[PDB]
RNA sequence: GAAGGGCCGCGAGCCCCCGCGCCUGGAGGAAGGAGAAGUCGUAACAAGGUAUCCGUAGGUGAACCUGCGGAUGGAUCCUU
RNA sequence: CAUCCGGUCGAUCCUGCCGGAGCGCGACGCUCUCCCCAAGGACGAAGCCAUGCAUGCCCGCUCACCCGGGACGCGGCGGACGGCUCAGGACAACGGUUGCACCCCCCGCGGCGGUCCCUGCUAGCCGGACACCGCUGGCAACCCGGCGCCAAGACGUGCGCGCACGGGCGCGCGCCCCGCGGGCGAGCAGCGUGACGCAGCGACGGCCCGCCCGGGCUUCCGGGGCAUCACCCGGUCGGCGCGGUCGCGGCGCGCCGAGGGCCCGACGCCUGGCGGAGAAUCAGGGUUCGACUCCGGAGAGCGGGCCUGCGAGACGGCCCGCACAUCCAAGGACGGCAGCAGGCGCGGAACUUGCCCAAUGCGCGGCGCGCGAGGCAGCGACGGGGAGCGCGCGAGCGAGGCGGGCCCACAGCCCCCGCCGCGCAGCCGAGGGCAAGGUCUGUGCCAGCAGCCGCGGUAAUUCCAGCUCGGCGAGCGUCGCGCGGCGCUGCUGCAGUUGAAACGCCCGUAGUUGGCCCCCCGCCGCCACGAGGAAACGGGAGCGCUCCAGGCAGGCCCGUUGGCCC
RNA sequence: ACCUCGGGAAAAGGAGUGGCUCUGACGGCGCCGGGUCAGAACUGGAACGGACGCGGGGAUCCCGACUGUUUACUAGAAAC
């Protein structure tokens, strides 16, 4: 998206009936500043802002680059 | 009436939403009132400056401009500001229809009478680009206020790289 | 075998939801085909006008004539067959005289030698059948 | 719900009021005033329930209407008038003067005070702002707006108001080594000195306070209320916020019942 | 709406899992013979009061010593069981609360206490005397045969002063 | 500044098409279940008088029969 | 709070279901001595409504009359709360956790109180202008017309002090960043100047600001089922400029780009689908239900639309369309019980057109009313709790009645005190499961019974009576359903050679799962402990309502309590 | 719907259309060509493919698959 990015927040949800967990994902829409360069896979830091659009309430304030061939890995960040 | 509620809108996934409630006064929206510039002052005086107050939430009166003729226009560099008649709306970024009907909206490029700013010609070394517009009797300015909410059409005289962008837009005609 | 991974809760929850349906009882409790099919429609009991007094034969090896009434339930206009319980009780029930019918007690299955009667009369014309049998109230 | 809520259910009303469940469907709802609904007790409950001076709600009106009760030295005739921490509740006709402080359990307690104490009222500055022509103004917990505050007094400090003149007699700063009573929260009434100020930027400053017994209690800095620089400079409840443990409380209850 | 709605209520009895067990039918009849009971519900109530007290004792025994709950709640269970007299004063431990029977619930009941004090010729005698309010505990007349007295009130249990000492002087049949 | 009118905005209700769900009438077909006590054979179970059965194809009053490739749950744990 | 047992056979051992046995919470039958507590037209009719009532209070303004008794009217505030119900709504509502440097707010509390002009002040205080009112009418009714008098703390103006001053403007930080600060975590606030504008309030001074309270959104995590629904959405997803709102935002539009969501189930459909605090059952783990009390949402026949106000898209406000009433003198008018009684319809099923503001609140008002909120009584085997139907051998009650007391808005109940005195049981069983006759008739595979297995065809332990007996008990039987039973849903903890069941084989993505190794570091989950967030409920300290279910009491007492937990 | 997956299909049905006054796109720039495709006002007895040119459509059944061909001068068909 133009000046916008989709972030995959990964989190575990614990159930009681089975003492095991469920790996879950949530896509949050952030706003990429033109200053920050990002590739699909980078660890971003997103900070809450005033509603900027229908789906955007966040802005990218830090970028951490990745080696592109970084596999995937469920990562709680 | 008009609703700014997102209940009518579809979800991010594009799914239909459910109407759980009827429309509420808090999410009311009002019919837009386009401030028409009175360019027909010579033809008729019946159309005078008509600003209408409206009752809003909390009894906060909002002044809605229906017809306007003048505004306070400010040349920031020279710090020269005077009330000026607005001659015409030339260039609106959203649509050319607003320019034809001469609606006053924020950011519409307007031509203002230079008769109040004629004094500035006497001091030279005061921006040649503004000075030759002053000699011509029309100066490029932009409305800096919202006429529908404030009720006034205050502005500022286009200067520096802004003046160049909008004079390039109106350059062929 | 079963899956035992710290993060396989989702699979176990899905497997339980899918395999819960195999039992007839979970289906006869949650599928909802029973609720539409039942002439009582989930009610404790129903009311309805008598249409026909019928002598129904008992299933083998029992040889007898069970006594029953065909009842059209006012609630859903659905004719059922209901046994009238006790001895000589049918004489109390006339035709078209209104009867309150409850089920037999096997939760919608036919019980005893009587076949297809899932219902039995409890009140005739607003008068309890057992009372008319013990001669506590007259017809 | 179309507008402001004018009614309070008895089950809804805060536990520190100690309103009996069978007493009514309704509970007194405090009017808007110097204290918030959670951080205040109505005047009906501080008279008909605590002192029993009025045996019914109509009698609370009859004694409040006669301005017999004085709150912060103000007649305060409203029955549902909020009374909160540091308000001076005095009845001259019965010659009793009370200052409302918090007990160790966390319920409000009407403490007997002296005429010198009645004169001053302790306030905490929540915020300092440039309102009304950029004029400096302070805001105290008891909804008091004082223009021209002393330039030094910062936020979280405790000011002392004259009540008669409504002037700041003195300011006690919020710092390590300062006597503090935690008002509201799980630790309520407890009196201790600040030992730690953990900022936790962007969220809540976490204050750790130590009792004379040496029991460390941690609470958010909003609940913390400075009492004085090294001594309270105000009447403190008889327990003095040392706080009893559950087995000690059992012992005190048994002692009281035995002397029946 | 209606403060009556907010009034609480609970069941004080727990019917047996199996109702027709011959060993457990006969034993209940014996426990009605020695205690003058009108119906089996009274024995069921006795087991509901004991089971709850035993459950507290078992949930505290599992808890570690010096865990505060064991020290506080256990002392409150012991004190209650001592004050009633269900727990013998000498034992003074949580384990002995687990090893108790419904005989101890029944013995503290007023009907059994009157026979021990020799005021009642039998338990059947006592039940009728308490219904006829001829019995006063600590200066208060009681009309309930399951009143259950505390160890202190045991001595204060006495024939009601206004009943069988003949202050009325014309009671029942004597009057006419 | 009223009645009134115009143009749009918010938006009933009706019309007309089109989906979508649910319930059904219906000659005439066609299964299953319960009677009845019928008729015609006897397919399987004893090597059940052609060992059964599996797939697949054909045929045949009907169970069935037959071809081809399996299996043994066979009637064979066994032979330069 | 760790239990099974009867039924496939000639017999046996299994699998496997069927039936029993426990509890709930409704219906139904039968029966009922007394007291206490208590739900109560929710259950595919959010169907429909006759009647009465549920919202008033005040006096600023009295030349209405009782003399200030004050009628009314005008003015003020409340009528947006509360009461009710659960239709709609399934990334919604709701619950915990956030933010508003994107906001709005009556009452009250505490501050603050400088308001240019020209014309034109009356400020020892100005106008006019209606209502009631009087007079005269139309009108089936509803509804109101004209004329005339005369008031407000009402209305319209206005005497104001150029650090005059509401809105919105234009301009005024930097020099890689961070370290005094009116204020922050953060460039936020405030103001200085240049123009515009001339807001409010001042005719018994409030604009304004903080606090409060409620609201608007908003952050994260949780937030039905179905794959015989696998691909879906195109204001859909972003950006930009305006408009609009209390404000942010595709909220809306113009323009540009092609995004957005998906087997970690998108989307579609369906829901006899409000959510939560909770409830039922229960060793543990769990399952099921969440109409109802408290909290938040939603709606007042159905769609819309609006006005007033600080707040309502309000229905005990109005306008309109549809559906359905109502009265009519035929022209017209006129509604809206998912308030409370009460009716009608429907269903298996659900209370009195009672009384009263005394308590507990709230609206207005220092001396006090209004309230179908709420309280009281009636009905009421929803249910819960406590006592009876004798003890005994000659004496005793309570069930009553009748009195007094107490209690009560008024009665009444309870309880106390005298007087008379008058105990009183059902409902299901007896072949087994499962406790209790191998009694005596009738009947003779009939009649019936029997959840299940079974009895009945002339020696019926099973039917129909008598007799005797068992269980439970003022309750017991029946039906429907939830949980337990049921390791017959299996996380704990099921099974798959043959009982039901390893995909014919192989590759393979998503998914799930991956040996060992570095002590000492950052991120994760993790465990412990804190903060902070409604109670009720559920526990649970202490307290003898006569016990008790209850309740938060009590007693000369921790500052008597009402702790503490979830 | 059906289907030989090509079709059916212009299926069925709807809505707009004139003149003026403008605004975008699109090449070859200083220049200099284009004539299409959008979008907006404003107008007009409620008018616009204003003449002209120019399918009515849907559900079936029989027959021949089809395009073709034929008794010039009575049968164009299902015949060949």
Q: What is the 3-state secondary structure (H, E, C) of D221-259?
A: CCCEEEEECCCCCCCCCCCCCCCCCHHHHHHHHHHHHHC
Cβ-contact B71, B151 below 8 angstroms: no
What range does the domain containing D25 cover? 1-116
Q: Residue C36: how many CA atoms within 13 Å on its side-chain side? A: 4
- Smallest CA–CA distance from E74 into chain D, residue: D247
Given in angstroms, what resolution was this structure solved at? 3.3
- Indicate if D78 and D66 belong to the same structural domain: yes
Residues in chain E with CB shorter than 8 Å from the CB of D25 are: 1-3
Q: Is D99 domain-assigned? A: yes
Strand H within 7 A of B97 CB = yes
The nt closest to C36 (CA vs C1′) is: G272
- What would the two tokens of residue B42 be? 């010579």
Mention every residue, 6+ apart, whose C-beta is less than 8 A from residue C56: C65, C66, C67, C68, C81, C83, C114, C115, C116, C117
Dihedral pair phi/psi, residue C65, rounded to 5°:
-110, 100
Note whether A21 contacts C7, CB cutoff 8 Å. Answer: yes
Q: Is D253 domain-assigned? A: no
Q: Please state, in angstroms and as integers, the Cα–Cα distance from residue A5 to each residue in A41, A55, A63, following that order.
A: 11, 11, 12
The nt closest to C57 (CA vs C1′) is: F35
Neighbours of E127 (CB within 10 A): 20
C-alpha to C-alpha distance for E174 and E168, rounded to whole angstroms: 10
Residues in chain E with CB shorter than 8 Å from the CB of D248 are: none
C-alpha to C-alpha distance for B141 and B166, rounded to whole angstroms: 10
Mention every residue, 6+ apart, whose C-beta is less than 8 A from residue B127: B77, B78, B159
Cβ-contact D163, D72 below 8 angstroms: yes
Q: Is E7 domain-assigned? A: no
Q: What is the DSSP string of D18-34?
A: ---TTT-SEEPPPPSSS
What range does the domain containing E70 cover? 19-166
Cβ-contact D130, D136 below 8 angstroms: yes
Q: Which residues pair with C99 in a beta bridge?
A: C48, C124
Q: Is D254 domain-assigned? A: no
The nt closest to B23 (CA vs C1′) is: G313
Contact residues of A toward B, CB < 8 A: 29, 54-55
C-alpha to C-alpha distance for D236 and D100, rounded to whole angstroms: 10
- What would the two tokens of residue C134 be? 């013990």
Note whether A20 contacts C13, CB cutoff 8 Å. Answer: no
- Indicate if D95 and D1 belong to the same structural domain: yes
Tokens 């009943």 sit on residue: E163
- What would the two tokens of residue D252 be? 């005190």
Mention every residue, 6+ apart, whose C-beta is less than 8 A from residue E40: E28, E32
Chain A: touching chains (3 or more CB pairs < 8 Å): B, C
- What would the two tokens of residue D156 be? 């979280």
Point out the residue nearest to G184 (C-alpha to C1'). Answer: D202
Q: How far is the CA of C33 from the C1' of G58 (A)?
A: 65
Query: Before C17, cis peptide (omega within 30)?
Result: no
C-alpha to C-alpha distance for A12 and C6, rounded to whole angstroms: 11
- Indicate if D11 and D93 belong to the same structural domain: yes
**Angstroms from E83 CA to nearest CA on chain D:** 13
Q: Is D252 domain-assigned? A: no
**Angstroms from A24 CA to nearest CA on chain B:** 18
Neighbours of D130 (CB within 10 A): 9
Among E144, E66, E73, E9, CA closest to E81: E73
- What would the two tokens of residue D255 be? 């002692």
The nt closest to B101 (CA vs C1′) is: H41
Long-range pairs, B164-171, Cβ under 8 A, ≥24? B166/B91, B166/B109, B166/B140, B166/B142, B167/B140, B169/B91, B169/B109, B170/B90, B170/B91, B170/B109
Dihedral pair phi/psi, residue D127, rounded to 5°:
-150, 145
Among C46, C102, C88, C48, CA closest to C70: C48
**Angstroms from C2 CA to nearest CA on chain A:** 12
Cβ-contact B99, B170 below 8 angstroms: no
Does the CB of B12 have a partner CB in chain A at under 8 Å? yes
Does the CB of B4 have a partner CB in chain A at under 8 Å? no
Dihedral pair phi/psi, residue D130, rounded to 5°:
-95, 70
Is the pair C, A in contact (3+ CB pairs within 8 Å)? yes
Bases along strand H below 7 A from a protein CB: 22-24, 40-41
Q: Please state, in angstroms and as integers, the Cα–Cα distance from residue A31 to each residue in A44, A53, A60, B9, following that order.
A: 11, 10, 6, 22
- Indicate if D134 and D180 belong to the same structural domain: no
Specify the number of domains making up chain E.
1
CB pairs under 8 A between A and C: 24
Among C120, C40, C33, C34, CA closest to C78: C40
Q: Which H helix or E strand runs over C129?
A: helix C129-133
Note whether A20 contacts C8, CB cutoff 8 Å. Answer: yes
C-alpha to C-alpha distance for A60 and A58, rounded to whole angstroms: 7
End-to-end CA distance of chain D: 51
Strand G within 7 A of C19 CB = yes
If you compute the radius of gyration of chain B from its CA atoms, what whole number of angstroms results?
20
> Of the candidates D48, D82, D116, which is a domain's last residue?
D116
Mention every residue, 6+ apart, whose C-beta is less than 8 A from residue E161: E136, E167
Locate the domains of chain B by residue range: 30-173
Cβ-contact D85, D101 below 8 angstroms: yes
- What would the two tokens of residue D202 be? 């962007």
**Alpha-carbon dihedral D188, D191, D193, D195, rounded to 10 degrees:** -30
Cβ-contact A24, A11 below 8 angstroms: yes
- What would the two tokens of residue E104 be? 């101890």
If you compute the radius of gyration of chain C from its CA atoms, what whole number of angstroms results?
21
Residue D178 burial (10 A CB sphere; 0-12, 13-18, 19+): buried
**Which phi-psi region, left, alpha or beta, contains residue D18 (left: φ > 0; alpha: ψ -120 to 50)?**
left
Note whether C9 contacts A12, CB cutoff 8 Å. Answer: no
Point out the residue nearest to G38 (C-alpha to C1'). Answer: E4
Q: Is D135 domain-assigned? A: yes
Q: Is D49 domain-assigned? A: yes
Among E103, E112, E122, E104, CA closest to E157: E112
Structure-determination approach: cryo-EM
Mention every residue, 6+ apart, whose C-beta is less than 8 A from residue E4: none
Task: Give the protein-side footprint of strand F (Cβ within 7 Å).
Answer: B 1-3, 31; C 36, 57, 59-60, 115
Q: How far is the CA of B92 from the C1' of G244 (A)?
A: 18
Tokens 């409380």 sit on residue: D249
DSSP state of E46: H
Strand H within 7 A of B79 CB = no
Mention every residue, 6+ apart, whose C-beta is less than 8 A from residue E128: none
Note whether C13 contacts A12, CB cutoff 8 Å. Answer: no
Cβ-contact D56, D48 below 8 angstroms: yes
C-alpha to C-alpha distance for C133 and A21, rounded to whole angstroms: 63
Mention every residue, 6+ apart, whose C-beta is less than 8 A from residue D254: none
Strand H within 7 A of B173 CB = yes
Specify the number of domains making up chain D.
3
Q: How far is the CA of E17 from the C1' of H77 (A)?
A: 94
Does the CB of D258 have a partner CB in chain E at under 8 Å? no
Residues in chain A with CB shorter than 8 Å from the CB of C8 are: 20
Q: Is E173 domain-assigned? A: no
C-alpha to C-alpha distance for D128 and D219, rounded to whole angstroms: 23
Q: What is the DSSP string of E51-79?
A: HHHHHHHHHHHHSPTTSSHHHHHHHHHHH
Is the pair C, D in contact (3+ CB pairs within 8 Å)? no
Q: Is D259 domain-assigned? A: no
Neighbours of D238 (CB within 10 A): 9
């Amino acid at each position: 998206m133009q000046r916008s990015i989709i972030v995959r927040r990964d989190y575990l949800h614990f159930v009681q009936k089975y003492k095991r967990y469920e790996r879950r994902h949530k896509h949050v829409a952030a706003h990429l500043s033109p200053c920050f360069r990002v590739k699909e896979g980078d660890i971003v830091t997103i900070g809450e802002c005033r509603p900027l659009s229908k789906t955007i309430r966040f802005n990218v304030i830090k970028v951490e680059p990745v080696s592109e061939a970084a596999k995937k890995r469920f990562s709680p960040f | 009436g008009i609703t700014h509620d997102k209940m009518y809108k579809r979800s991010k996934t594009g799914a239909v939403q459910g109407k759980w409630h009827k429309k509420r006064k808090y999410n009311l929206g009002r019919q837009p009132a386009n401030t028409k510039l009175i360019v027909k002052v010579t033809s008729k005086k019946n159309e005078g400056q008509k600003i209408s107050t409206i009752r809003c939430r909390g009894g906060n009166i909002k002044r809605r401009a229906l017809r306007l003729s003048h505004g306070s226009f400010a040349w920031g560099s020279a710090d020269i500001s005077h009330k000026a008649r607005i001659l015409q709306v030339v260039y609106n970024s959203t649509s050319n229809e607003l320019v034809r009907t001469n609606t006053l909206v924020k950011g519409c490029v307007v031509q203002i009478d230079s008769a109040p700013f004629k004094s500035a010609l006497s001091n030279d070394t005061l921006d040649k680009e503004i000075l030759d517009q002053i000699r011509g009797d029309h100066i490029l300015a932009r409305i800096s206020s919202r006429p529908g909410q404030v009720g006034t059409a205050d502005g500022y005289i286009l200067e520096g790289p802004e003046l160049l962008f909008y004079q390039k837009k109106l350059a062929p005609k | 075998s079963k899956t035992s991974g710290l993060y396989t809760a989702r699979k176990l929850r899905t497997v339980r939801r899918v395999n819960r349906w195999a039992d007839k009882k979970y289906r006869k409790a949650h599928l909802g085909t029973w609720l539409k099919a039942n002439p009582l429609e989930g009610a404790c009991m129903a009311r309805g006008i008598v249409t026909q007094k019928i002598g129904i034969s008992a299933k083998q090896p029992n040889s007898a004539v069970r006594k029953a009434v065909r009842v059209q339930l006012t609630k859903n206009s659905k004719k059922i067959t209901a046994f009238v319980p006790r001895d000589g009780s049918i004489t109390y029930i006339d035709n078209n005289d209104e009867v309150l019918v409850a089920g037999f007690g096997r939760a919608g299955r036919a019980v005893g030698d009587i076949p297809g009667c899932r219902f039995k009369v409890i009140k005739v014309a607003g008068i309890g059948l057992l009372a008319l049998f013990l001669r506590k109230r007259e017809k | 719900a179309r507008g402001v809520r004018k009614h309070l259910k008895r089950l809804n009303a805060p536990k520190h009021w100690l309103l009996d469940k069978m007493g009514g469907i309704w509970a007194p709802r405090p009017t808007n005033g110097p204290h918030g609904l959670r951080e205040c007790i109505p005047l009906i409950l501080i008279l008909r329930n605590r002192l029993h001076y009025a045996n019914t709600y109509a009698e609370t009106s009859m004694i409040l209407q006669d301005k017999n009760v004085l709150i912060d030295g103000k007649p305060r005739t409203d029955p549902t008038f909020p009374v909160g921490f540091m308000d001076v509740f005095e009845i001259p006709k019965v010659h009793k003067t009370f200052r409302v402080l918090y007990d160790v359990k966390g319920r409000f307690t009407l403490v007997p005070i002296q005429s010198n104490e009645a004169g001053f009222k302790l306030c905490r500055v929540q915020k300092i702002f440039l309102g009304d022509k950029g004029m400096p103004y302070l805001s105290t917990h008891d909804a008091r707006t004082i223009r021209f505050p002393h330039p030094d007094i910062k936020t979280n400090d405790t000011i002392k108001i004259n009540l008669k003149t409504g002037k700041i007699d003195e300011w006690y700063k919020f710092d390590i080594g300062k006597i503090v009573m935690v008002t509201g929260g799980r630790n309520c009434g407890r009196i201790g000195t600040i030992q730690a100020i953990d900022k936790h930027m962007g969220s809540y400053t976490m204050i750790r306070m130590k009792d004379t017994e040496g029991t460390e209690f941690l609470t958010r800095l909003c609940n913390v209320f400075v009492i004085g620089n090294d001594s309270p400079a105000v009447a403190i409840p008889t327990t003095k916020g040392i706080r009893p443990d559950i087995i000690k409380n059992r012992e005190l209850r048994l002692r009281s019942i035995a002397k029946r | 709406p209606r403060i009556s709605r907010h009034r609480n209520s609970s069941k004080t009895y727990s019917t047996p899992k199996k109702p027709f067990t011959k060993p457990r039918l006969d034993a209940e009849l014996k426990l009605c013979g020695e205690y003058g009971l009108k119906c089996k519900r009274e024995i069921y109530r006795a087991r509901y009061m004991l089971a709850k007290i035993r459950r507290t004792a078992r949930n505290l025994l599992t808890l570690d010593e010096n865990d505060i709950k064991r020290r506080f709640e256990g002392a409150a269970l012991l004190r209650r069981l001592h004050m009633l007299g269900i727990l013998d004063e000498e034992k003074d431990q949580l384990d002995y609360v687990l090893g108790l029977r419904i005989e101890d619930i029944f013995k503290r009941r007023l009907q059994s206490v009157i026979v021990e004090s020799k005021l009642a010729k039998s338990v059947h005698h006592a039940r009728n005397m308490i219904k006829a309010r001829h019995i006063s505990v600590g200066g208060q007349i009681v009309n309930i045969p399951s009143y259950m007295v505390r160890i202190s009130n045991t001595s204060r249990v006495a024939i009601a002063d206004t009943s069988s000492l003949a202050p009325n002087g014309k009671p029942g049949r004597t009057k006419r």
